[PDB]
Amino acid sequence: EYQLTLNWPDFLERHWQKRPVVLKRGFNNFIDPISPDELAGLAMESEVDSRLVSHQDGKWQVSHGPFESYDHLGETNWSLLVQAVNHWHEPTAALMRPFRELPDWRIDDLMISFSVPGGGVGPHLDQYDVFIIQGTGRRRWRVGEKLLQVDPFEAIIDEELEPGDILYIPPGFPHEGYALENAMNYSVGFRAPNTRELISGFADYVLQRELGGNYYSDPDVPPRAHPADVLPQEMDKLREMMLELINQPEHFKQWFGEFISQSRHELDIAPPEPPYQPDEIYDALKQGEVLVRLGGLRVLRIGDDVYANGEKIDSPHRPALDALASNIALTAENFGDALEDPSFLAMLAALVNSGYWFFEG
Amino acid sequence: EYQLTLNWPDFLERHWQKRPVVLKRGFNNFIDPISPDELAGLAMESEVDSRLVSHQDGKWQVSHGPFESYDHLGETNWSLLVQAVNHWHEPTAALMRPFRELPDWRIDDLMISFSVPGGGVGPHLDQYDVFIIQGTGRRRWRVGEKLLQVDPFEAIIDEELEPGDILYIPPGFPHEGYALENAMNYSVGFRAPNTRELISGFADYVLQRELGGNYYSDPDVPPRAHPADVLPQEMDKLREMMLELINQPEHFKQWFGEFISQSRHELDIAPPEPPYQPDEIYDALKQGEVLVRLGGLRVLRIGDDVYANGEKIDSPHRPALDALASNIALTAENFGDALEDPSFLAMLAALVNSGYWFFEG
Ligand SMILES: O=C(O)CCC(=O)C(=O)O
Ligand SMILES: O=C(O)CCC(=O)C(=O)O
Numbered sequence: 001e002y003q004l005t006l007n008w009p010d011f012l013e014r015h016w017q018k019r020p021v022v023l024k025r026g027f028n029n030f031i032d033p034i035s036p037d038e039l040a041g042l043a044m045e046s047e048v049d050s051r052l053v054s055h056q057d058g059k060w061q062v063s064h065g066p067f068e069s070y071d072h073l074g075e076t077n078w079s080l081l082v083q084a085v086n087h088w089h090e091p092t093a094a095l096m097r098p099f100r101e102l103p104d105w106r107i108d109d110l111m112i113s114f115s116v117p118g119g120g121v122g123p124h125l126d127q128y129d130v131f132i133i134q135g136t137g138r139r140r141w142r143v144g145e146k147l148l149q150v151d152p153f154e155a156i157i158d159e160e161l162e163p164g165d166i167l168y169i170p171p172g173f174p175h176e177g178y179a180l181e182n183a184m185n186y187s188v189g190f191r192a193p194n195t196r197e198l199i200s201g202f203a204d205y206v207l208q209r210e211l212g213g214n215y216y217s218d219p220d221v222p223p224r225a226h227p228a229d230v231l232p233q234e235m236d237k238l239r240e241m242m243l244e245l246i247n248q249p250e251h252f253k254q255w256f257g258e259f260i261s262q263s264r265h266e267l268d269i270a271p272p273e274p275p276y277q278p279d280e281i282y283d284a285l286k287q288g289e290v291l292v293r294l295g296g297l298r299v300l301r302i303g304d305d306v307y308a309n310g311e312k313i314d315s316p317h318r319p320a321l322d323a324l325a326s327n328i329a330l331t332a333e334n335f336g337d338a339l340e341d342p343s344f345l346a347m348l349a350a351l352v353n354s355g356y357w358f359f360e361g
Numbered sequence: 362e363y364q365l366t367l368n369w370p371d372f373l374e375r376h377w378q379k380r381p382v383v384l385k386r387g388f389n390n391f392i393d394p395i396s397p398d399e400l401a402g403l404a405m406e407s408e409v410d411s412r413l414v415s416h417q418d419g420k421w422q423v424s425h426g427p428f429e430s431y432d433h434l435g436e437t438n439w440s441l442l443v444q445a446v447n448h449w450h451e452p453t454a455a456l457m458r459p460f461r462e463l464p465d466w467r468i469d470d471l472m473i474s475f476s477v478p479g480g481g482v483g484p485h486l487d488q489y490d491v492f493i494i495q496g497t498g499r500r501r502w503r504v505g506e507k508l509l510q511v512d513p514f515e516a517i518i519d520e521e522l523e524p525g526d527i528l529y530i531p532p533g534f535p536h537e538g539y540a541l542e543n544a545m546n547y548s549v550g551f552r553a554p555n556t557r558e559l560i561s562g563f564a565d566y567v568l569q570r571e572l573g574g575n576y577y578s579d580p581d582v583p584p585r586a587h588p589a590d591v592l593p594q595e596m597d598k599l600r601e602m603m604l605e606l607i608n609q610p611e612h613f614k615q616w617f618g619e620f621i622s623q624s625r626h627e628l629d630i631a632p633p634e635p636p637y638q639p640d641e642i643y644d645a646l647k648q649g650e651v652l653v654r655l656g657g658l659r660v661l662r663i664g665d666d667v668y669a670n671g672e673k674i675d676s677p678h679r680p681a682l683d684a685l686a687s688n689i690a691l692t693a694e695n696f697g698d699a700l701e702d703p704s705f706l707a708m709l710a711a712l713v714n715s716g717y718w719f720f721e722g
């Protein structure tokens with residue numbers, strides 16, 4: 001397992017969502033989980049979101065994958081960036097574990113860039129927190145003060161990253177990175193909803209479930225000098241209906257569990273055929289087999305319920321469920337007596353048959 | 362003009378959104394604004410929403426317009442119902458004026474039914490308030506107590522309506538009406554949003570305007586024993602973001618003005634060609650011409666702004682604008698000095714060119 005040398009309370013107190021910082025030797029003896037060639041290969045696949053970025057003579061150029069080849073690209077001034085490699089490559093997903101000191105619901109995916117000297121995407125800022133882990137090679141990273149693609153900035157951090165160095169950047173800090181030597185960078189990205197996404201999502205939920213069917217009612221309709229007027233008390237009442245629908249706590253929790261447990265990038269969903277019967281799940285677990293969560297699959301506990309990729313999961317076996325949320329790899333011990341409950345077993349079978357968890361690989 | 366004999370404070374105190382009631386002789390010497398033949402003719406048009414409802418030997422049958430003919434229908438047991446005749450026929454729109462004792466924003470449209478003896482749509486309840494005005498002929502109306510198409514009920518009102526009688530029904534009271542003699546009924550309908558429609562609309566508004574771009578921020582991210590958990594304080598914060606976006610008062614007002622001023626039925630939008638220049642509007646008004654609001658067009662005042670068919674209207678000429686909201690027919694006096702303001706004139710020209718108001722007809 002990858003192991004951070006970070007002082008976490010320090011980082012949280014001084015840097016998280018406050019100030020960028022180079023974590024020198026964040027990882028000791030850093031070994032890359034994937035090679036440039038493997039990355040390129042991955043970028044050859046259609047299910048994978050990737051891009052190639054180039055710059056020559058002052059002018060940029062972006063291409064989107066999949067790429068049939070790379071036959072002629074150049075020695076310098078380009079970079080291949082692949083989103084969510086952790087959805088497609090397990091060793092890569094291992095890089096994200098140490099960052100579980102921060103909450104799962106806030107973590108996004110892992111983006112990998114390979115760059116030849118000069119390669120990079122130019123000066124910009126992002127709306128999300130990011131840890132950029134330096135793998136093989138070397139890159140110059142610059143970060144300016146809080147103000148996509150921005151004007152040139154005066155740097156407050158200007159560093160050459162070495163294998164195992166990590167650059168943390170809060171949202172809104174302009175930054176710029178380019179390779180000095182053939183370089184792999186691993187961006188553990190975070191994600192945070194905005195209010196627009198929240199109200200949109202919740203509205204979709206309410207439409208789908210046919211909730212909020214209560215009509216404005218006015219047996220005490222107020223008088224007005226002008227019949228076309230809409231009075232502030234009526235407005236206040238309608239507004240209050242809206243707020244009240246939002247404050248129905250159980251519905252709020254269910255909607256948010258479904259909303260937030262969805263991923264921002266395509267998952268490698270491969271439903272088993274033929275489907276698993278509950279008995280197979282039982283037997284396999286009892287025989288000591290490991291149930292593995294699909295890479296990038298979001299699984300979060302909200303109250304007593306667990307939410308996996310948009311689906312709610314409810315069971316009177318609390319520790320087993322919590323095991324589903326916390327553990328990437330699972331064994332019979334994690335579930336305990338819950339495996340004797342056939343309703344629970346059928347639930348696990350449904351999850352596996354959806355391709356959300358798989359045995360061993 | 363049609364004139365109600367109703368005691369309005371009584372009706373509001375005892376009946377509005379509380380209890381159904383037959384208003385005997387609501388109108389004196391009631392003259393129908395439209396004939397059965399004209400209604401049928403209207404139902405022959407494609408832009409018009411209508412239906413024919415029949416019952417024979419225990420079994421119902423519904424057909425939707427437009428109808429090429431009525432050649433063979435029967436002497437009995439059917440009814441033609443046309444939605445929003447006030448969108449298509451001015452004398453009909455005149456029936457709605459007396460009901461402006463209730464707020465414009467709560468009023469819907471006017472639906473007209475013609476029925477031969479036995480004709481009617483059967484026992485049902487509605488989610489909106491309605492005044493059913495009896496025109497020519499006679500109908501038996503029954504209304505049961507608060508509980509679409511319902512089981513048979515024990516009536517609390519069971520009356521034969523005569524020309525000029527009006528049956529008021531609050532939402533949720535089952536009712537049943539059928540003709541005794543060839544009968545015209547005029548339903549002045551009301552409408553009230555539900556919470557689902559409100560949050561949907563507001564969400565659409567926020568998406569369209571790109572509002573709510575503020576991201577959840579957690580420099581004070583709370584500790585947890587389990588990394589997959591989502592804590593109640595974080596939930597409370599997200600919820601609070603939602604509520605706060607809803608409570609931005611000016612945005613709330615604009616969104617609601619745009620939302621509520623839309624009609625539930627197709628309008629007769631006929632943009633003039635060639636378009637009116639502001640000067641023509643000025644001249645026509647100055648010469649004494651009458652500017653007429655399009656039938657069914659919703660125009661409502663919210664704060665200082667006026668909203669017409671989804672469009673916001675802002676002008677430092679308050680009385681003129683208020684005139685746009687309150688008056689169906691307008692003359693130069695209604696606008697006063699505002700007509701000397703070319704920005705205002707251009708505004709009127711835009712409204713007319715959209716077909717929202719027209720000169721004289
Ligand atoms: O790995 C890279 O070079 C790019 C990382 C980055 O800052 C971004 O794409 O937002
Ligand atoms: O005019 C009619 O017969 C029908 C009125 C009514 O109750 C309805 O359609 O909801």
Ligand SMILES: [Co+2]
Pocket residue numbers: 124125126175
């Ligand atoms: Co960036």
Ligand SMILES: [Co+2]
Pocket residue numbers: 485486487536
């Ligand atoms: Co009805």
